[PDB]
Design a protein around this ligand. Structure first.
Ligand SMILES: *C(=O)[C@@H](NC(=O)c1c(-c2ccccc2)noc1C)[C@@H]1N[C@@H](C(=O)O)C(C)(C)S1
Ligand SMILES: *C(=O)[C@@H](NC(=O)c1c(-c2ccccc2)noc1C)[C@@H]1N[C@@H](C(=O)O)C(C)(C)S1
Ligand SMILES: [Cl-]
Lengths: 241, 242
């Protein structure tokens, strides 16, 4: 069912970095990783939390839809792309923390807690309300990411079908005549080790490949590798050209 | 509100072809074409019919969802990609006529008629084969009537369930990167003259939506690449994509 493929370590090594890639071939009901232990190591979700955050916000009417505008509170921050108005689409695309802090506040630790349980999301621990996924108690592994994503793909999370379709739309990262990628980036720097995340899936004509990957991210220089390494692995297994 | 930009004719000319591109800047409530007359000229919709077809099928339970498999009736056809099983996603991606003929048959001329009226879709004329009228029958739609229909689909304003619309928009997904998302549908009409290519859909940006309808003379199947290439060359020029 699960199989180690240590040959993928080469892809981490050649960029002088450590980390895990987990693939799941949906049709064959089989999974593949370069490191079974790290694949099961839990980390802070960072901006990958914006998936379940988005879903809970939508199901509760905190977000009416994906066109609804979230007004810049007018305070400049370090990320240029955060200093302007956003909708759920641009909120996810640009990982706009303040917008999701604001959703989290309206959602409320009571309901957020209930929902993460119902989702079976990582360790279901909200030790913090407006920061817990950045610097608090919540932890999720690569394989628990796949598990959550697989439920989102088949509209099996304990929220309305609409809420899921909207979040999957919002996850749209890349598409052409070969594949569709739906995914969410993450960068956790508050608690060591500093890691990059890329979780989502590859839609083909006739199969779906789910992916969760995290890698050591000591410096923000490496961030390009989250996508590049996952893709190098997807190329190798002839999932994309 | 509407503005002629004859400079775009260059893009048709340079490939020795005639045709129209219609843009609509949603935010500014303004439209742009290389030819106001042709922009209003109606043609057979061809595979662009798969949008309203998909919507009606979904709203009526002919299609349960986008994963549901449509089993190849086992008869080899000219188009390699048609000779295998399909779901609403691959059905749209590869313009699989037989699948949509089959939906049309189940939908039934009575309901298909009512729905195209409610949609205000082109000339609302289904007359011909229930299973062929959008290929060789009576239905006619212009570039501008395409935008109108598309604009309603974008805001989930067609008199069909929101779900049905979301699914068809998903299925329209053609292209996406960190700059833009294109949702669109191709068409090739060769049964009745004049032979034309279609590309209708829209470009999603961070803060705006550009709707596009384009058709061009398509005497030979050699030109088909130009449907996307000319639209893109125009989208480049107006600095909508890089
Ligand atoms: C999500 O991961 C976003 N970042 C955080 O939530 C976050 C950061 C951060 C890193 C760099 C700049 C600003 C904040 N540190 O800890 C956390 C929990 C997005 N990650 C970054 C990325 O490049 O992927 C950004 C710039 C998109 S914000
Ligand atoms: C949709 O328009 C499809 N074509 C037709 O429905 C169609 C054709 C046709 C032309 C060439 C090959 C097969 C069918 N002739 O009249 C009609 C109404 C799709 N058009 C083609 C394209 O290249 O866009 C295909 C191959 C995608 S089928
Ligand atoms: Cl989508």
């Amino acid at each position: 069912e699960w199989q180690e493929n240590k040959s993928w370590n080469a892809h981490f090594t050649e960029h002088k970095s450590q980390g895990v890639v987990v693939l799941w071939n949906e049709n064959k009901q089989q999974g593949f990783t370069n490191n079974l232990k790290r694949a099961n190591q839990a980390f802070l979700p960072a901006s990958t939390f914006k998936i379940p955050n988005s879903l809970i916000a939508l199901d509760l009417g905190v977000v009416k839809d994906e066109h609804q505008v979230f007004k810049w509170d007018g305070q400049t921050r370090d990320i240029a792309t955060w200093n302007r108005d956003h909708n759920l689409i641009t909120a996810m695309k640009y990982s706009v923390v303040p917008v999701y802090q604001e959703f989290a506040r309206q959602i409320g630790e009571a309901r957020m807690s209930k929902m993460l349980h119902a989702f079976d999301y990582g360790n279901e621990d909200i030790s913090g309300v407006d920061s817990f996924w950045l610097d608090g108690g919540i932890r999720i592994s690569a394989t628990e990411q796949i598990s959550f994503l697989r439920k989102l793909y088949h509209n099996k999370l304990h929220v309305s079908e609409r809420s899921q379709r909207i979040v999957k739309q919002a996850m749209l990262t890349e598409a052409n005549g070969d594949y569709i990628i739906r995914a969410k980036t993450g960068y956790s720097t508050r608690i060591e080790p500093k890691i990059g995340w890329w979780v989502g899936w590859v839609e083909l004509d006739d199969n779906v490949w789910f992916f969760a990957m995290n890698m050591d991210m000591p410096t923000s220089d490496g961030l390009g590798l989250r996508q590049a390494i996952t893709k190098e692995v997807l190329k190798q297994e002839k999932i994309i050209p």
